[PDB]
Amino acid sequence: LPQTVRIGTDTTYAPFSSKDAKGEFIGFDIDLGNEMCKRMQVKCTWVASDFDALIPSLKAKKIDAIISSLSITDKRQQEIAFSDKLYAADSRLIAAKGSPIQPTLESLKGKHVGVLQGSTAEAYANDNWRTKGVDVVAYANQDLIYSDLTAGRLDAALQDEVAASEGFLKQPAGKEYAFAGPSVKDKKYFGDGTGVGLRKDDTELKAAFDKALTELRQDGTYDKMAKKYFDFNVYG
Ligand SMILES: NC(=[NH2+])NCCC[C@H](N)C(=O)O
Ligand SMILES: [Cl-]
Ligand SMILES: [Cl-]
Ligand SMILES: [Cl-]
């Protein structure tokens, strides 16, 4: 294991990863990463990046791990490895309160829909909606999506359900917004939970993260840290 593990994250996805008023990284991903590093007896350096630059940075050895609500998908397992599941993640649309929008091609006719570049939401929306004439706009970060949604430039946005609820719907900017239909189920695109992204050959590092994650779940640390942000079973 390296003496210092470099962990990449995109800090625009509260409650998982974001910045506080002093610029410190905060959220459930940060708490999990720091606790796992403590148990692994390694020092940790957090590195902020746009989400779509995380896998390229990991492959180029600029970072050693990704903790950034990274969904475990078949496509990504062909290029990188993952730790065991950190928590569940499903994608769901948001739109103005009272909107008739549903996550269907018919409902989205003539709508402007924002997605994060590099995300499972972008991959799903581009293949199923953009090809079929929905104006799917990809963004460098999720904060730009929420801002364009509030400016009226977007009609809807697709992202992880827990991030939209806690990071936007339950925040001042999101009071005028709500979920638009149910979460989207699609095995191929959305994967099964999130994990620490790692290079495929870093077998010792994966085993260390997996061991620390099991240990923090066994002793109840996982649930106690989760309580700060969630009143439900985020693990799934
Ligand atoms: N920190 C972030 N911006 N995370 C975005 C994650 C979205 C989705 N779970 C994915 O893996 O594509
Ligand atoms: Cl910090
Ligand atoms: Cl240490
Ligand atoms: Cl288990």
UniProtKB/Swiss-Prot annotation:
Effect recorded for L116K: Changes ligand specificity. Can bind glutamine. Still able to bind basic amino acids, however, with 1000-fold less affinity for arginine
Binding of L-arginine, residues: D10, S68, S69, S71, R76, T120, D160
Residues reported to bind L-ornithine: D10, S68, S69, S71, R76, T120, D160
Entry superkingdom: Bacteria
Compartmental location: Periplasm
Impact reported for Y13A: Shows a drastic decrease in arginine and histidine binding affinity
Comment on protein domains: Has a bi-lobal structure. Contains two globular domains separated by a deep cleft wherein the ligand-binding site is located.
Record-given protein name: Lysine/arginine/ornithine-binding periplasmic protein
Gene: argT
